[PDB]
Amino acid sequence: MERFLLNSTVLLYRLSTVSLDEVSLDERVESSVFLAQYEQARSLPDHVAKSAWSYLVQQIKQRNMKLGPVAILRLIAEKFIKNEKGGPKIDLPMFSEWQTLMSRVSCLPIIACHQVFNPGPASQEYSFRWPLYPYHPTVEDYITRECLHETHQHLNGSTSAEECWLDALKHPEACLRDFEKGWASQEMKQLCAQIDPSLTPRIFKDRLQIACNIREILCRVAQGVELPEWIASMQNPQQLANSTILHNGREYGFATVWPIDDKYSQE
Amino acid sequence: SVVKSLNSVNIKCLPTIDPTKLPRHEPILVTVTARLNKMVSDKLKGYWASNDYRKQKEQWQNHLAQLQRGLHLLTDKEYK
Amino acid sequence: SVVKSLNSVNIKCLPTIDPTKLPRHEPILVTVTARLNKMVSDKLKGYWASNDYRKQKEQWQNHLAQLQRGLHLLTDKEYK
Amino acid sequence: IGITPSIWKRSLPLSLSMTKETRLLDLVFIWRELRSHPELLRYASDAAIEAVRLAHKVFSLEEEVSITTLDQVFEMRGLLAESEGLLSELNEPLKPKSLWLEEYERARELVKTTGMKRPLKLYKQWLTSDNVRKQRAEYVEVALEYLPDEAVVALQQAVMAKMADRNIAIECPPTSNTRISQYRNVSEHHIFRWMGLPGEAIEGDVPMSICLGSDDPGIFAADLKSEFYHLFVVLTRKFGLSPADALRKVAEVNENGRIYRFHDV
């Protein structure tokens, strides 16, 4: 039920256009998410969707949280992921409906939230590279004893799909050439409209450029460095569509310095 | 005052070590190495899981581990 | 009498403590934190899951833990 | 969960003895796994009635306590005694973030919450009451055949369903260990019941996962290989199994020690 708030075009439209000054969006998210579930899983009756959303709001309030990605990712991480012998592993009974979640919501944000608010055993070293798998001793014994066998593994592209988003960030304009060449074909014209009806190549560049600036802006919060004192200029998320903001009439950039040589990678 | 402008040939200064503001019996090495090991690993922690992090950290750990035998060799009750 | 005037900007005063009216081998710093931990715990109980009750609590628990890992050496007789 | 109740009753007095606290935990438990049983209700109903009788003897209480309250009291016995709000004063300063503060406050908050502290106050007497602790250690007399032969089997098959669901293996002692003092020979050992030998498996049993171990064989010179052969011999001779089929049954036990190995991957 929480996958809608993390994968829905209609919320993105109501968040990529409305300014950051006002804070109260509890109504505008509730109305939007029901449209989001309407266009994603229409087989759900309204009252089931109404109550399930009402419980979600009520469940958050009892924990003294505020509705947002920092709080929603908490709920999913504790609902699905639990520590085990191998570290963070998905619980076996809930695995099947987790796989449904992966079709709409990426795993990278979820695993990060679980580590922060529920660390591993004795702070044991853990670098995340592979998607989480449920642990069952019977299968684990068989796999180690007799290895798996793959028969259809498309080599080209990326190792998985979540990292291809990172590769897309490395080419904010070159990936548009793939988009523009594909957009000439009628098949890609319909497929793009299937997800969001108002999807145009400039919007695709709009969102990718916006996603690029958000990564840098929030990185400065993670690194601990103080805010670059041009955020006061930006109050509308659309202003992040040009990789440069104008505050007191001078050029102010968004790109920051990262400790890693390759700032665009899984780690 | 000396160390304030000195932080600006590149030099680094450990925070001042006062034996009075310390346990009465702890020798100098364990105190100074605690200061020394704190930043140098924190400087490594400044990096985020880079390739050079693992090489420098593990070789640093061996340096401390091989010196742990003599950390007890700063006098004792009786030899064993 | 001085603390009476202060209790009656806001300034908080901790109750007077006496090393003679205390165990001989218990240092002052553990005692001053004991009285200091008395009030902060009491104020947290007053909130009882009000706004940002967890925020102050957890930042306090970690701070007490970090102090505890430095409290053994102060009472420790020698180095080990 | 291995010994057949008929075998267990061999050469025992007509009425055994056990501590009241161990008896009360039995009576509250037997109600849990028998009221679910559609035909073994008389035993469940009688147990629930007389467990309430025993609770009055132990807690010395004067008001009414139901079997539901007793179960709620006994489900909170896993908490640590020194958890705040349970035995120590509720208003105490917070301890400095040990690995125990998660345990200390967890048993604290859930006790405070649910809006139900009546079972908790019963539990404190179960821990820190002079009379209750003395009454618990006072022994009681229990009939040997309190439950009929089939009734005990119902509990054992209930354990199997629960633990096989949790998928928890069982260490089996060496069968050369004549420590039980209940089996006439090795062929009657309960390990054969778990593995599913015809003529030694009780109907309705839920097969488990059984690993192999040799800790206290009770003999002078022993090894795991000797125990492995001991199991293989009995199947071929006493139970009449072909060597190819006999090995597979004992091979399953030897492999379960590898499926549930504690060694890191």
Next chain:
Amino acid sequence: PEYFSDALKLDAQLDYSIGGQDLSEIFEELVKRACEILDCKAILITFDDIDTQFDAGWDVLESIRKFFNSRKLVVVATGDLRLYSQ
């Protein structure tokens, strides 16, 4: 080090102004509860003569000055004040 986690304990009665491991803090409410239980406004304690070994009375002087301070507890001392000076 393991003592401090066992320290800090609160005085659950009368909520005195002193919190911690001080035993005097933990003593007055016991006396007052004893006094109301024992239907008295105070308890009289008698310390006998220390003529034989006055060195034994040093702990009594500490116990009187460090813990015997409540209004609802009366103590009768004796001996020779000159030896206490010694």
